[PDB]
Amino acid sequence: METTYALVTGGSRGIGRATVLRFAREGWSVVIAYKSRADLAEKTAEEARRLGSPEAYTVRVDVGDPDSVTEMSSRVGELIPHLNVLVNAAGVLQLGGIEETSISEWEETLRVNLTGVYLVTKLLLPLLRKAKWASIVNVASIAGETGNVVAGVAYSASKAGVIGLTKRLAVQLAGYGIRVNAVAPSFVETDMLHPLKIILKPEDVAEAILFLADPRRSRGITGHVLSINAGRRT
Amino acid sequence: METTYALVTGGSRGIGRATVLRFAREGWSVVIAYKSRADLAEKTAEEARRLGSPEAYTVRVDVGDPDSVTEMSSRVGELIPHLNVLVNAAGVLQLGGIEETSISEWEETLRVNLTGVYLVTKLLLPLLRKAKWASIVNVASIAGETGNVVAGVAYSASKAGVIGLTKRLAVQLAGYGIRVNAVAPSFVETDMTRSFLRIASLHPLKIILKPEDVAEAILFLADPRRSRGITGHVLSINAGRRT
Numbered sequence: 152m153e154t155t156y157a158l159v160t161g162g163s164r165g166i167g168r169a170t171v172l173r174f175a176r177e178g179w180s181v182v183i184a185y186k187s188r189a190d191l192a193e194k195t196a197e198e199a200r201r202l203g204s205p206e207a208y209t210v211r212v213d214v215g216d217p218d219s220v221t222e223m224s225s226r227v228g229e230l231i232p233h234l235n236v237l238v239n240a241a242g243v244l245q246l247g248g249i250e251e252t253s254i255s256e257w258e259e260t261l262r263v264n265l266t267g268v269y270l271v272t273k274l275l276l277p278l279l280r281k282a283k284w285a286s287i288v289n290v291a292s293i294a295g296e297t298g299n300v301v302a303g304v305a306y307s308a309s310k311a312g313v314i315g316l317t318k319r320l321a322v323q324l325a326g327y328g329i330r331v332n333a334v335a336p337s338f339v340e341t342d343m344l345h346p347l348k349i350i351l352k353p354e355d356v357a358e359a360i361l362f363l364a365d366p367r368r369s370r371g372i373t374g375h376v377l378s379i380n381a382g383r384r385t
Numbered sequence: 386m387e388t389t390y391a392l393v394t395g396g397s398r399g400i401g402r403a404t405v406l407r408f409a410r411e412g413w414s415v416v417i418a419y420k421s422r423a424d425l426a427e428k429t430a431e432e433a434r435r436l437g438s439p440e441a442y443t444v445r446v447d448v449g450d451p452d453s454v455t456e457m458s459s460r461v462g463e464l465i466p467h468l469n470v471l472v473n474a475a476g477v478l479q480l481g482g483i484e485e486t487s488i489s490e491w492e493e494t495l496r497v498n499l500t501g502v503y504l505v506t507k508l509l510l511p512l513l514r515k516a517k518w519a520s521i522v523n524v525a526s527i528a529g530e531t532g533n534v535v536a537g538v539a540y541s542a543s544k545a546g547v548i549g550l551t552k553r554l555a556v557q558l559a560g561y562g563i564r565v566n567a568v569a570p571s572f573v574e575t576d577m578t579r580s581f582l583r584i585a586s587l588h589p590l591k592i593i594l595k596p597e598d599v600a601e602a603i604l605f606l607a608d609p610r611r612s613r614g615i616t617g618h619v620l621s622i623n624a625g626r627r628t
């Protein structure tokens with residue numbers, strides 16, 4: 152088989168970083184996409200190489216900016232022959248009701264959390280179509296599933312939008328054999344109410360992302376939202 | 386004791402228009418918010434008054450533009466004392482897969498269908514809070530509930546966003562006693578004639594969904610006498626295409 156290549160936005164922290172390292176343990180080559188923490192990205196790359204990635208690259212990108220994403224895309228195309236897995240995990244949190252959410256805050260949240268997913272996926276599709284097999288995993292949130300959670304109105308709207316995008320892309324891209332799924336975690340403990348007495352960690356979400364990314368495990372699953380909330384919402 | 390006032394965006398055509406007229410039959414005063422066809426909006430206002438609206442007003446607004454919405458809310462505040470019902474039905478269609486959907490096409494779709502609902506609701510909240518009872522009904526789409534439909538990627542994302550927004554506002558605004566729900570219709574006979582010489586065979590119930598069928602669901606969700614205990618719900622109208 153061909154070498155496996157995975158790209159993870161928000162790959163230098165939280166869920167994205169945990170996902171990159173989980174992929175490395177699988178022997179998958181990785182591309183760590185980050186906005187500004189070049190230091191954290193390179194240190195993540197060094198751990199990925201130690202853990203098992205044949206190759207680990209870093210690439211700077213602002214997912215909410217079209218030009219930045221277009222450049223990242225070209226840059227990535229110069230480093231790898233194809234892309235098997237794309238994980239969009241570069242979302243940003245937002246809090247507050249509609250009265251306290253200013254128009255600029257609303258727009259910025261949608262630009263990064265929703266438009267960013269569409270942009271990264273759009274520009275990297277040619278690389279994904281070149282792979283013998285491919286999958287896409289978007290990191291949504293329980294906030295996109297329900298209003299009964301403390302999250303800003305823009306955050307909830309953007310995450311629900313990510314879920315809608317995930318489902319439509321799954322059906323539309325199924326023709327190319329590309330699977331598209333999402334994970335919807337509840338509160339996750341990072342460097343920033345439920346029946347099961349545990350605290351979700353980035354590594355817990357990474358396991359779920361790996362399951363959905365790997366065709367050996369989920370080849371028949373597409374357009375699904377895998378909820379990880381320790382039972383807060385069934 | 387107080388007159389019922391309802392505002393409907395996209396009120397001069399399709400679902401919005403049918404809703405305005407159904408509201409008029411209920412004896413509610415209506416504000417017809419429209420984007421460009423001032424002539425059709427006035428015709429709607431006339432028909433509303435004839436049907437039962439004590440008062441019928443028209444207001445121009447581009448829900449995708451902050452200045453336009455802000456100006457619209459100011460004008461509305463000069464015409465009515467409060468607002469009991471808000472219906473956001475000013476959405477636009479978008480077709481195409483991700484490769485076929487240009488960045489600008491995506492942005493404009495989100496701007497109108499999702500950000501527009503947020504804008505209108507945000508600028509009119511003061512008037513809604515002034516009323517003794519209030520409810521918001523957003524028009525989503527089956528496209529926001531499932532990927533198994535023919536609709537563009539941006540359209541599906543924006544409508545799913547509308548549903549997420551609806552749910553969160555329902556929980557957040559419950560404190561003010563304001564209910565927020567959504568209707569999610571599938572194919573509806575409207576100025577989307579593109580699909581006409583099959584669609585009626587897309588569902589178990591062999592019927593043809595009309596704007597007035599959606600208007601009935603919107604009325605149910607808007608009227609507290611009918612749905613006082615319902616909030617944050619998405620009422621699907623698809624003749625069984627999706628259960």
Ligand SMILES: NC(=O)C1=CN([C@@H]2O[C@H](COP(=O)(O)OP(=O)(O)OC[C@H]3O[C@@H](n4cnc5c(N)ncnc54)[C@H](OP(=O)(O)O)[C@@H]3O)[C@@H](O)[C@H]2O)C=CC1
Nearest residue numbers: 161164165166185186187188212213214241242292338339
């Ligand atoms: N924590 C939670 O409770 C939950 C989180 N999520 C989702 O997890 C995903 C990541 O969250 P989390 O891991 O906490 O986030 P972090 O706060 O750890 O950082 C988020 C990532 O966003 C990255 N980022 C932001 N913009 C870009 C960009 N434009 N390009 C590349 N990276 C970008 C940051 O990179 P840098 O700063 O270096 O640019 C950072 O690694 C998001 O989709 C989030 O919404 C979902 C549900 C729950």
Ligand SMILES: NC(=O)C1=CN([C@@H]2O[C@H](COP(=O)(O)OP(=O)(O)OC[C@H]3O[C@@H](n4cnc5c(N)ncnc54)[C@H](OP(=O)(O)O)[C@@H]3O)[C@@H](O)[C@H]2O)C=CC1
Nearest residue numbers: 395398399400419420421422447448475476526572573575
């Ligand atoms: N038809 C279908 O199959 C389905 C439709 N829907 C939804 O129904 C809602 C309306 O669709 P439909 O009734 O067919 O649309 P129409 O094509 O009949 O017209 C849509 C309305 O959009 C109005 N409009 C667009 N922008 C604005 C604006 N900025 N301010 C005020 N009005 C605006 C137009 O008014 P003017 O041109 O006068 O400015 C028009 O009345 C949308 O949310 C749509 O997505 C949902 C599911 C299915």
